Amino acid sequence: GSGVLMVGPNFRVGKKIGCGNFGELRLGKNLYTNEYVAIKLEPMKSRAPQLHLEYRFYKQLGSGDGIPQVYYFGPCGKYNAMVLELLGPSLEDLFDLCDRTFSLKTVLMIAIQLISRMEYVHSKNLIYRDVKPENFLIGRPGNKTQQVIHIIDFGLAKEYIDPETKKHIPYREHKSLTGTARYMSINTHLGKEQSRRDDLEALGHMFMYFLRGSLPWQGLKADTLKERYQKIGDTKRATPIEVLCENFPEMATYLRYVRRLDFFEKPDYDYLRKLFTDLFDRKGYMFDYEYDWIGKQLPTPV
Numbered sequence: 256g257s258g259v260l261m262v263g264p265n266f267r268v269g270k271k272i273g274c275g276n277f278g279e280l281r282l283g284k285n286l287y288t289n290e291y292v293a294i295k296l297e298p299m300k301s302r303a304p305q306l307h308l309e310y311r312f313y314k315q316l317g318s319g320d321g322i323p324q325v326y327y328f329g330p331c332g333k334y335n336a337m338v339l340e341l342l343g344p345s346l347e348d349l350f351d352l353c354d355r356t357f358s359l360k361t362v363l364m365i366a367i368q369l370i371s372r373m374e375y376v377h378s379k380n381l382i383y384r385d386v387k388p389e390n391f392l393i394g395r396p397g398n399k400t401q402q403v404i405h406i407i408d409f410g411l412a413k414e415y416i417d418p419e420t421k422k423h424i425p426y427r428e429h430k431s432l433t434g435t436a437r438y439m440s441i442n443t444h445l446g447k448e449q450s451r452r453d454d455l456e457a458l459g460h461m462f463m464y465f466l467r468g469s470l471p472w473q474g475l476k477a478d479t480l481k482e483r484y485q486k487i488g489d490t491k492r493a494t495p496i497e498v499l500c501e502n503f504p505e506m507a508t509y510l511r512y513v514r515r516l517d518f519f520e521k522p523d524y525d526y527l528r529k530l531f532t533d534l535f536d537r538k539g540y541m542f543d544y545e546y547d548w549i550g551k552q553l554p555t556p557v
């Protein structure tokens with residue numbers, strides 16, 4: 256007939272965008288509003304569905320600062336599709352653009368926002384569990400949120416507060432390893448149930464990754480994912496914070512604070528933000544959103 260894919264009543268499905276995916280993320284256009292959007296697709300034939308409740312997690316999250324807006328979730332051919340706000344490049348894309356190292360001022364502007372970003376998620380009774388540069392996106396050139404660091408892909412999320420009992424989820428071990436090894440907390444490596452602290456420790460590893468240019472467990476390979484996971488975990492446990500965070504005292508303080516958090520414990524986000532804003536102010540930095548990537552030329556799918 257038409258040969259054109261539509262999602263819902265007004266969303267035209269466009270070209271495949273981004274790297275990886277394999278057709279899972281497409282540019283889209285709201286024909287009614289003449290606006291571009293991002294469309295996440297998941298084959299209805301999927302063995303491990305995530306789209307629909309990722310959608311639910313977004314519902315649960317609600318309209319929020321740094322949270323992409325979701326417009327639609329519906330069937331599209333042999334695909335379930337979720338239409339949401341089109342954003343810009345990820346911190347990983349920007350990192351490469353900046354030769355794989357961010358200035359402390361850029362990392363602190365990022366860190367201050369993400370601690371708040373994570374606290375927001377946590378305030379909605381959700382733990383993220385998928386921290387990595389690729390899941391943090393700036394907005395787009397003009398849609399006035401380009402300097403806001405956004406958080407995306409809540410497929411690995413989990414409700415850490417039982418909705419009925421209103422109790423924190425129970426501690427337990429033997430959780431299989433799946434997330435990304437490079438940033439995951441040490442306890443995640445130990446097979447322990449993840450909680451608030453783990454999102455915060457993962458952010459710490461990522462902050463040091465940005466500052467150093469790389470992490471010391473980064474090149475570890477093995478004959479089985481499990482083994483690789485185990486080696487990376489061994490090295491994380493074998494690298495002293497003072498060594499990992501050499502030259503960044505605040506980062507070491509942030510890291511061992513979160514590493515020592517109790518499983519059920521509510522992090523003191525104010526305390527962590529202050530470690531960084533005090534530093535920020537002492538260095539003489541001005542929070543003006545002028546990241547290292549400002550002035551460089553960014554990739555735009557449109």
Ligand SMILES: COc1cnc(-c2cnc3ccccc3c2)nc1-c1cc2c([nH]1)CCNC2=O
Nearest residue numbers: 272273293323339340341342343407408554556
């Ligand atoms: C609000 O969601 C999103 C909004 N914009 C974009 C975007 C924007 N400009 C771009 C410019 C160049 C290249 C790629 C781009 C991707 N990507 C996403 C998004 C969500 C998800 C993913 N990408 C990947 C896996 N899982 C997700 O949940």
